[PDB]
Design a protein around this ligand. Structure first.
Ligand SMILES: CCCCCCCCCCCCCCCCCC(=O)OC[C@H](CO[C@@H]1O[C@H](CO[C@H]2O[C@H](CO)[C@H](O)[C@H](O)[C@H]2O)[C@H](O)[C@H](O)[C@H]1O)OC(=O)CCCCCCCCCCCCCCCCC
Ligand SMILES: CCCCCCCCCCCCCCCCCC(=O)OC[C@H](CO[C@@H]1O[C@H](CO[C@H]2O[C@H](CO)[C@H](O)[C@H](O)[C@H]2O)[C@H](O)[C@H](O)[C@H]1O)OC(=O)CCCCCCCCCCCCCCCCC
Ligand code: CLA
Ligand code: CLA
Ligand code: CLA
Ligand code: CLA
Ligand SMILES: CCCCCCCCCCCCCCCCCC(=O)OC[C@H](CO[C@@H]1O[C@H](CO)[C@H](O)[C@H](O)[C@H]1O)OC(=O)CCCCCCCCCCCCCCCCC
Ligand SMILES: CCCCCCCCCCCCCCCC(=O)OC[C@H](COP(=O)(O)OC[C@@H](O)CO)OC(=O)CCCCCCCCCCCCCCC
Ligand SMILES: CCCCCCCCCCCCCCCCCC(=O)OC[C@H](COP(=O)(O)O)OC(=O)CCCCCCCCCCCCCCCCC
Ligand SMILES: CC1=C(/C=C/C(C)=C/C=C/C(C)=C/C=C/C=C(C)/C=C/C=C(C)/C=C/C2=C(C)CCCC2(C)C)C(C)(C)CCC1
Ligand SMILES: CC1=C(/C=C/C(C)=C/C=C/C(C)=C/C=C/C=C(C)/C=C/C=C(C)/C=C/C2=C(C)CCCC2(C)C)C(C)(C)CCC1
Ligand code: OEX
Ligand SMILES: [Cl-]
Ligand SMILES: [Fe+2]
Lengths: 62, 33, 336, 30, 449, 238, 144, 60, 37
């Protein structure tokens, strides 16, 4: 269970880094926000799912 | 050269490189800066 | 035409035709400053000795009690009182009031209020005359410095006795004891303040000499150029281009100021920021955050100590520390 | 004896300041 | 963005280009709030990861952890850290919420509506519209009152807050009877700021703190409701300048006063800033030194009451200028100090000679020695002791850091208030760009004497 | 006074602080019997013995009459919490001895001419005896300044320069030989106490006192003056 | 100099101040929390002394209306009572320590009420709170 | 005691008022100045040649 | 210290608080890249 929790935390970190790097780039291009909305929405959803999963799994490793 | 110090330096490099990366990406592709 | 008593009073107070502007900040400024001035003069001339350390050891500071201008001062309030409010009506008699150091507190409070009102009145006249309101912002640096040496340092040290005396030799004593206790010379904020004053003198001399060197000929050799300038004239009286050419050949072209407005802003900004930082340093050192302590820093292979100029400074500080108050200490640590 | 001299010097300086402020040569716009 | 060509503001004054852009201004404010929450979370995580249990909180350079300790989180009787998990939880929550706040700020600053006065009339405003500004002020007053009530609920129903004056040593108590007396609340507010009085810094029990917070929450909620339903009167319209920079200057002055008060409270207070988590104060160290030297010399067979110093005043005990029995030496200026370890030995007329001659406790002696050695003195490179010491101790008190930093911030924000108030008053009148050559005001006045 | 021991103990430190009530001695209640009263003869343990002065008079050296004075050092002139022993005989003779407690307080007063007169108000080693009408005795008056006290020029008895370091050329300074020597010698005084009330129920006594002693001499560099101190006093017998 | 025999001062606690200032030692040793946990005899003696002092002296002070003396007594020697009770109760099984914790919480609430009444300067209410506090302290002592 | 004094420093009174006479002085002077201002505040406003409506004041 | 399950991520925590200063520097860098128009 500990390994799964650490893998989830690492996935959360890498998803957060990808979002931080990419969201300003997508938002700051001409006619890029109006087209690549789905990728940003899916990234935000995955970020929220990962944070909820990490919060749930923290109760067993602590 | 401790492993912990190497990891801290790697994390610092990753965090610092995330700032001008956005500027470089937006300037190279002609974004709205 | 004004008719009401209050309307006429407001028109008189906010009048720009007075010889000295009064304003609404001057209403507060004039009586407090007059009170402080009167008490200062009377105490400097004929005040009795004041017990400053609270150890029943009065210190003389008056001209009538065997002092000159260099030696005379106004002794700060007694150490027994501390930070307590000590107005003239809280004393059993004026003899007791003068023995504990009341005039110092009176003058300090009135002077603080007066300088704040002075800065406010500077803004007020700038507004009334149609100017831009930042000469008051410039004055904030000396105001902050005076506040730091008279209010904030006693606030952080727990007593008005650690405040700066209103004298010359008292000022020197304050400086020496401050160095012995906080190592002010090693403080980066004091270094910035020293840089500020030195650069201010440098740039004042530089600007004055450059302007005086480019005066356009409007007189003869038997009269001064000041007679060559006429008050209220419209044309500029010196060659900014010539001065810039001279300076840019003195150092290099892109080091001088081609913009008079930018040059004068730099002149305003340098000393003001320097004094701001030095006042901040004094206020920070009030709460016991001293300067750099490079004592026994250089150590050789076997562990012995190799001394340094910092260690010589430390020896001087130790010399002036064990003697700043001979009989006021009963315990080894000066925690205040 | 010297206290009188000190007070006289200070009073003279203050009087000079007062006279300089209130009896100055008025500027005139040409 | 924009440029100096169409704005007149240079790059070093570029944030003034969004004075009249409501959407971009809102985005900037939301991004800044996200930055604040990010710093809070990151600093909490940094401090929780570098905490060792063998040293007290004030000995490890922590400033955010003692804030959570005073709320009764992860602390036990006597002021000893037991659990360190709630600090981690708080830091994680702050850090995660900062991401949402930052995304909102970035969205509203980059691709959000530029001026939300036509599509969102409820959120749109004009700086010169007094009613809308007053409505916003009322809404935020209601929010702040709710925050104060949220603080109040913690000390009553959700486990309480740390009380350093609790009987049998400090412990996390529950405040059941807060002081809501108008005379008590008004006594702190309209008190003198000088020694002995101390203004609001002199609050000495948690009941007064909770009562004052009840008062402030009720006042803020009532004022918010009052402002939502009203508009400024004639006497208020006649006295203020109505522009965004003017409102900014007012806020700057208010928060400068707040910063000075925070500095003084950190330096002087002991109730809301327990010495168990912040270390001894200025006066506390001196009183502790005198107390421990008195105890040591008494253990060596000496008469402390009748001992005479070099000046003839009293080595250990003397009389305050009003009559109270106080510690002797240069600590005679700190006789207004009142701490939990020293109060039990104090009688109605000051220190009790019999109590300190026969009823001094080892825990009191240990507290005095610890607060004596950890005095709030240090250097810029974190070297403990007086300026004439050696490099042996790496310690600077957490009170010193907070006090110095917040005094600097308060002074700089006072200067900012001066700058912005002057500029607003000049710009509203209409001569912030210089004097008019055609119509110079001075040329139309009669010359002075 | 105008407050009893129970009334004083019924207050709080925050209520007494700043009101100058800590510089005063308690008075007895209506139950106190006049004079010695009905105390069983014997030796008691004196406790909470305090003396609150009510007047200071100064007789300058060269004058035969005392003069009024104005205090300059505020409310710091009350001796309190002294302990000792009290013996009562069957005839009525009482003997009082003071061992410990705060039995000294420096005081400074100003006189008609304008001269500050420091003195060391103390009843250290009090030894009085006599009838309840009046007890006559004596006490020791320690030096105002300690042996390690250093004058403005750094001259002290047990620590400091033995000469004037400023005047380097004057090798011996035979003109300054008087002021270069410091002596912190002690002296004695006289007391005259009386008893006005006594409560045998709780063992409390009160009365008045008059004491005479000498002012300071700046470590043997001045001629001391005579100062008369009078006031009330209070004590507990148990 | 002149010699003096003070070798018995160490047996009187001369090293407490020097040990409390020893930065090499841990904070638990400096504060005395380590010694009490190691040696429960000190904790038991302190608890018994605190109980006896509370009873006798609180009765005496409330009878004579000595509010400041009463509060100071409540926090002068009793100042280690919470830590001592926690240390004693931590060496008990789960159910026994749970009952001890409940009794200690009830007793501490009683002491808080008594201190509040002493601060408010009430006589009958303070006497009733003191009787309740004595009963609760006896119950929690019997539980341990 | 030897002499008499106010004995009020370091107490914590509201505005430093130990006697009702200080309160009376403060209130009387404040009320006098306020009344003088209140009589004239109507005339003072009229010097701007504008009515004190919701758009009054220095605005930008 | 951090809980035992979060021990491997300690180096990440040690560099977090400098990000606001990095943000100020990034604003300056963006202004420079825009060429201070
Ligand atoms: C309405 C308008 C104002 C009306 C009144 C104006 C009066 C002006 C008089 C003239 C002199 C100037 C003001 C002097 C202030 C001195 C403050 C001081 O001695 O002390 C400050 C007090 C601290 O009070 C302390 O409070 C302490 C609290 O006591 C208790 O505190 C705890 C209580 O639990 C502990 O138990 C503790 O042991 C116990 O002692 C003690 O009582 C101390 O004796 C007491 O001194 O703080 C406070 O009042 C809180 C903060 C006050 C404001 C900020 C002060 C610092 C900034 C100064 C001004 C700005 C400077 C920078 C700009 C310069 C350019 C313009
Ligand atoms: C624009 C600026 C232009 C000039 C820049 C100059 C260089 C600044 C950057 C380098 C600073 C540095 O190398 O800084 C070094 C330190 C980090 O180093 C560590 O600093 C520690 C400091 O002690 C702390 O930690 C110790 C060990 O736990 C003790 O607990 C001690 O009590 C506690 O204070 C120890 O010395 C460690 O050994 C050491 O490794 O940076 C820190 O702490 C954090 C630094 C940022 C702090 C920002 C907030 C400052 C708030 C106070 C302001 C006061 C008012 C102004 C005064 C002037
Ligand atoms: C406290 C932070 C701060 C904030 C929030 C703002 C906010 C703002 N600035 Mg100001 N500014 C600041 C400091 C700040 N500034 C400083 C220090 C300076 C001096 C150098 C300036 C000087 C300045 C100028 C000269 C101008 C502004 C303008 C603007 C506004 C328009 C933005 C834009 O058009 O360009 C944004 C440009 C880019 C596309 C760069 C994108 C980089 C992104 C935003 C980085 C943040 C991303 C982060 C790493 C990850 C977040 C994602 C999330 C999922 C976690 C914006 C609201 C403009 C304006 O006036 O508008 C009318 C403009 O003209 N500013
Ligand atoms: C509390 C919030 C606050 C806010 C929202 C503003 C808002 C504003 N300020 Mg004010 N100001 C404040 C506080 C504040 N100020 C304080 C505390 C001071 C100190 C005295 C000033 C001093 C000030 C000046 C001197 C000026 C303004 C001006 C302005 C405008 C442009 C700012 C700019 O573009 O930044 C760009 C940011 C930078 C170039 C970064 C500089 C970094 C500083 C110097 C030090 C680095 C910080 C380090 C941690 C210490 C904007 C309306 C400008 C103006 O045009 O007004 C209309 C202007 O000239 N402000
Ligand atoms: C009725 C609707 C409404 C509500 C609920 C709020 C509520 C809020 N606004 Mg305001 N605001 C409104 C209308 C409203 N606003 C309008 C119409 C405008 C004009 C565009 C603004 C402009 C505005 C700005 C520019 C900012 C806010 C901010 C905030 C937040 C400040 C509290 C905070 O700092 O936490 C700390 C304080 C507390 C007491 C703790 C919370 C306790 C809970 C509430 C109980 C808060 C969530 C600030 C912010 O935080 O943004 C994220 C911000 O910068 N507001
Ligand atoms: C967030 C802070 C806040 C701010 C910025 C404002 C801002 C403003 N208020 Mg509002 N207000 C607030 C909170 C706030 N208020 C609260 C909490 C209440 C409930 C008490 C009120 C009740 C209120 C009233 C009744 C009035 C205003 C008015 C005004 C305007 C006049 C400015 C002024 O104060 O004159 C400058 C200030 C003064 C000349 C002196 C004030 C200082 C007081 C007298 C100090 C002593 C406090 C007082 C006696 C309260 C008791 C203390 C407490 C312990 C109970 C201005 C828009 C006026 C208006 O225009 O309404 C539409 C007005 O008549 N306000
Ligand atoms: C609050 C309304 C403000 C309205 C606008 C005011 C504009 C400015 C006017 C001028 C102000 C400066 C001069 C004031 C002189 C009179 C006051 C004086 O000397 O009092 C000096 C007196 C001293 O009172 C002393 O009291 C002793 C017992 O305590 C004894 O009785 C002494 O005899 C007695 O003199 O103190 C007071 O009156 C207390 C004032 C308390 C004020 C509380 C204000 C609360 C609201 C504002 C909070 C923020 C305040 C600023 C904080 C940050 C500052 C950096
Ligand atoms: C706003 C009202 C309350 C403001 C004063 C609060 C301060 C209370 C102090 C102690 C309590 C008093 C009990 C007391 O101790 O008395 C004595 C007290 C003197 O002050 P003290 O120092 O004793 O206050 C006590 C504390 O300082 C220490 O405990 O006198 C007053 O407070 C007078 C206040 C009344 C003046 C306010 C009148 C408001 C009504 C105006 C008409 C309204 C009509 C509306 C029609 C719809
Ligand atoms: C310690 C004090 C002891 C007593 C006093 C000792 C002597 C002190 C100095 C006495 C003489 C003072 C000046 C006499 C001439 C004044 C003329 C005047 O103002 O208007 C007439 C004069 C009449 O001309 P009209 O108005 O055109 O009719 O008015 C002027 O404006 C004349 C222009 C010159 C103005 C004064 C020039 C400088 C005078 C000296 C300044 C320094 C004085 C230092 C001492 C101050 C007092 C302590
Ligand atoms: C607009 C603009 C600007 C600004 C901006 C800003 C200000 C922003 C902000 C932003 C922000 C403010 C952001 C934030 C973010 C955050 C995040 C993204 C977070 C994350 C987190 C995490 C991932 C965590 C993790 C963890 C856990 C869960 C547990 C423990 C461990 C750890 C820590 C690992 C500038 C200046 C450039 C200029 C131009 C314009
Ligand atoms: C929580 C708490 C508490 C409480 C508190 C409170 C309740 C407070 C309040 C407060 C307040 C209630 C405050 C107020 C303030 C105010 C002010 C600060 C004002 C100002 C004003 C001004 C500045 C004005 C000006 C002017 C003039 C004079 C003229 C014309 C123009 C104008 C209008 C601008 C206590 C302490 C108990 C305890 C602790 C905690
Ligand atoms: O008084 Mn002036 O100087 Ca402030 O530290 Mn401690 O106390 Mn005294 O010695 Mn160092
Ligand atoms: Cl000392
Ligand atoms: Fe110039």
């Amino acid at each position: 269970m500990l390994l799964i929790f650490q893998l989830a935390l690492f996935a959360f970190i890498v998803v957060s880094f990808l979002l931080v790097v990419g969201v300003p780039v997508v938002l700051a291009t001409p006619e890029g926000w109006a087209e690549n909305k789905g990728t940003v929405f899916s990234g935000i959803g995955i970020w929220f799912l990962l944070v909820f999963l990490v919060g749930i799994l923290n109760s067993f490793v602590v | 050269m401790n492993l912990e110090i190497v990891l801290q330096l790697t994390a610092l490099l990753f965090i610092v490189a995330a700032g001008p990366l956005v500027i470089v990406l937006l300037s190279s592709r002609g974004g709205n800066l | 035409e004004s008719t009401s008593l209050w309307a006429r009073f407001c028109e008189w107070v906010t009048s720009t035709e007075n010889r000295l502007y009064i304003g609404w900040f001057g209403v507060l400024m004039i009586p407090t400053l007059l009170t402080a001035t009167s008490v200062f003069i009377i105490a400097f001339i004929a005040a009795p000795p004041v017990d400053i350390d609270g150890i029943r050891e009065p210190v003389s500071g008056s001209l009538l009690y065997g002092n000159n201008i260099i030696t005379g001062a106004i002794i700060p309030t007694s150490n027994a009182i501390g930070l307590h409010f000590y107005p003239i009506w809280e004393a059993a008699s004026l003899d007791e009031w003068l023995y504990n150091g009341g005039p110092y507190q009176l003058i300090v409070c009135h002077f603080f209020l007066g300088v704040c009102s002075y800065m406010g009145r500077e803004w007020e006249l700038s507004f009334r005359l149609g100017m831009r309101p930042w000469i008051a912002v410039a004055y904030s640096a000396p105001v902050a410095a005076a506040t730091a040496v008279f209010i904030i340092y006693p606030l952080g040290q727990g007593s008005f006795s650690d405040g700066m005396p209103l004298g010359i030799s008292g000022t020197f004593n304050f400086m020496i004891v401050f160095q012995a206790e906080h190592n002010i010379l090693m403080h980066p904020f004091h270094m910035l303040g020293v840089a500020g004053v030195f650069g201010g003198s440098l740039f004042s001399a530089m600007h004055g000499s450059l302007v005086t060197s480019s005066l356009i000929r409007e007189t003869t050799e038997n009269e001064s150029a000041n007679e060559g300038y006429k008050f209220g004239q419209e044309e500029e009286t010196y060659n900014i281009v010539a001065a810039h050419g001279y300076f840019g050949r003195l150092i290099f072209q892109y080091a001088s100021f081609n913009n008079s407005r930018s040059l004068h802003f730099f002149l305003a900004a340098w000393p003001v920021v320097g004094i701001w930082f030095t006042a901040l340093g004094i206020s920070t050192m009030a709460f016991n955050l001293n300067g750099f302590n490079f004592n026994q820093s250089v150590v050789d292979s076997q562990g012995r100590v190799i001394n340094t100029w910092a260690d010589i400074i430390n020896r001087a500080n130790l010399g002036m520390e064990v003697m700043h108050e001979r009989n006021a200490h009963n315990f080894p640590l000066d925690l205040a | 004896m010297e206290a009188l001299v000190y007070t006289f010097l200070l009073v003279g300086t203050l009087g000079i300041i007062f006279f300089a402020i209130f009896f100055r040569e008025p500027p005139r716009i040409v | 963005g924009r440029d100096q060509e169409s704005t007149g503001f240079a790059w070093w004054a570029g944030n003034a280009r969004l004075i009249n852009l409501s959407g971009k201004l809102l985005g900037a404010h939301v991004a800044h709030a996200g930055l604040i929450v990010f710093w809070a979370g990151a600093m909490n995580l940094f401090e929780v990861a570098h905490f060792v249990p063998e040293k007290p909180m004030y000995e490890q350079g922590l400033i955010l952890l003692p804030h959570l300790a005073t709320l009764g989180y992860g602390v036990g009787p006597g002021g000893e850290v037991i659990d360190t998990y709630p600090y981690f939880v708080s830091g994680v929550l702050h850090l995660i919420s900062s991401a949402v706040l930052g995304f909102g700020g970035v969205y509203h600053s980059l691709v959000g509506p530029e001026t939300l006065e036509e599509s969102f009339p409820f959120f749109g405003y004009v700086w010169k519209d007094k009613n809308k500004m007053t409505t916003i002020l009322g809404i935020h007053l209601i929010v702040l009152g709710l925050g104060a009530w949220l603080l109040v609920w913690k000390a009553m129903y959700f486990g309480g807050i740390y009380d350093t004056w609790a009987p049998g040593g400090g412990d996390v108590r529950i405040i059941t009877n807060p002081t809501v007396s108008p005379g008590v609340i008004f006594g702190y507010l309209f008190r003198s700021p000088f020694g002995g009085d101390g203004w609001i810094v002199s609050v000495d029990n948690m009941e007064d703190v909770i009562g004052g917070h009840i008062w402030i929450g009720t006042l803020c909620i009532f004022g918010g409701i009052w402002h939502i339903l009203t508009k400024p009167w004639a006497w208020a319209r006649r006295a203020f300048v109505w522009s965004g920079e003017a409102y900014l200057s007012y806020s700057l002055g208010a928060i400068s006063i707040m910063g000075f008060t925070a500095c003084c409270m950190a330096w002087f207070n002991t109730t809301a800033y327990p010495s168990e988590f912040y270390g001894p104060t200025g006066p506390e160290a001196s009183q502790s030194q005198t107390f421990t030297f008195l105890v040591r010399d008494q253990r060596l067979g000496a008469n402390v009451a009748s001992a005479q110093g070099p000046t003839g005043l009293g080595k250990y005990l003397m009389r305050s200028p009003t009559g109270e029995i106080i510690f002797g030496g240069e600590t005679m200026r700190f006789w207004d100090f009142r701490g939990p370890w020293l109060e039990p030995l104090r009688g109605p007329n000051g220190l009790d000679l019999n109590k300190l001659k026969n009823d001094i406790q080892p825990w009191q002696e240990r507290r005095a020695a610890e607060y004596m050695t950890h005095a709030p003195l240090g250097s810029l490179n974190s070297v403990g002791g007086v300026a004439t010491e050696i490099n042996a101790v790496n310690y600077v008190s957490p009170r010193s850091w907070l006090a110095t930093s917040h005094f600097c911030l308060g002074f700089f924000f006072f200067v900012g208030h001066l700058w912005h108030a002057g500029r607003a008053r000049a710009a509203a009148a209409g001569f912030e760009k210089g004097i008019d050559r055609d119509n110079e005001p001075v040329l139309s006045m009669r010359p002075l004497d | 006074g105008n407050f009893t021991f129970d009334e004083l103990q019924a207050k709080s430190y925050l209520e007494v602080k700043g009101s100058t009530l800590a510089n005063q001695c308690p008075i007895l209640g209506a139950d106190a019997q006049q004079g010695l009263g009905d105390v069983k003869p014997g030796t008691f343990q004196l406790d909470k013995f305090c003396m609150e002065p009510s007047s200071f008079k100064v007789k300058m050296p060269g004058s035969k009459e005392f003069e009024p004075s104005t205090l300059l050092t505020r409310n710091t002139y009350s001796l309190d919490q002294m302990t000792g022993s009290v013996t009562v005989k069957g005839d009525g003779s009482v003997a009082l001895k003071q061992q410990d407690g705060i039995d000294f307080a420096p005081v400074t007063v100003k006189i008609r001419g304008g001269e500050m007169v420091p003195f060391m108000f103390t009843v250290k080693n009090l030894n009085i005896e006599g009838k309840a009408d009046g007890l006559t005795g004596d006490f020791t008056v320690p030096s105002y300044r300690g042996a390690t006290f250093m004058d403005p020029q750094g001259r002290g008895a047990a620590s400091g320069w033995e000469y004037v370091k400023g005047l380097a050329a004057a090798g011996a300074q035979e003109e300054l030989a008087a002021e270069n020597v410091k002596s912190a010698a002690a002296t004695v005084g006289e007391a005259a106490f009386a008893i006005a009330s006594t409560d045998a129920a709780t063992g409390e006594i009160a009365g008045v006192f008059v004491t005479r002693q000498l002012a300071d001499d700046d470590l043997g560099s001045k001629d001391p003056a005579t100062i008369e101190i009078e006031g009330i006093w209070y004590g507990q017998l148990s | 100099l002149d010699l003096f025999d003070d070798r018995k001062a160490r047996q009187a606690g001369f090293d407490i101040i020097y040990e409390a200032r020893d930065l090499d030692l841990p904070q638990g040793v400096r504060d005395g929390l380590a010694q009490a946990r190691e040696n429960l005899d000190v904790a038991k003696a302190r608890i018994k002394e605190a109980e006896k002092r509370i009873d006798a002296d609180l009765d005496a002070y409330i009878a004579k209306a000595y509010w400041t003396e009463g509060r100071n007594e409540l926090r002068r020697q009793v100042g280690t009572l919470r830590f001592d009770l926690n240390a004693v109760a931590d060496t008990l099984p789960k159910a026994a320590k749970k009952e001890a914790q409940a009794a200690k919480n009830e007793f501490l609430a009683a002491v808080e009420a008594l201190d509040l009444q002493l601060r408010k300067k009430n006589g009958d209410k303070a006497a009733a709170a003191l009787a309740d506090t004595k009963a609760k302290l006896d119950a929690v002592i019997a539980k341990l | 005691l030897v002499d008499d004094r106010l004995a009020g420093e370091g107490t914590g009174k509201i505005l430093g008022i130990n006697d009702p006479s200080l309160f009376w002085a403060i209130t009387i002077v404040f009320t006098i100045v306020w009344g003088v201002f209140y009589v004239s505040t109507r005339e003072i406003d009229a010097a701007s040649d504008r009515e004190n409506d919701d758009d009054f004041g220095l605005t930008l | 210290k951090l809980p035992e399950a979060y021990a491997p991520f300690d180096p990440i925590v040690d560099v977090l608080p400098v990000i606001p200063v990095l943000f100020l520097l990034l604003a300056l860098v963006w202004q420079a890249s825009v060429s201070f128009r």
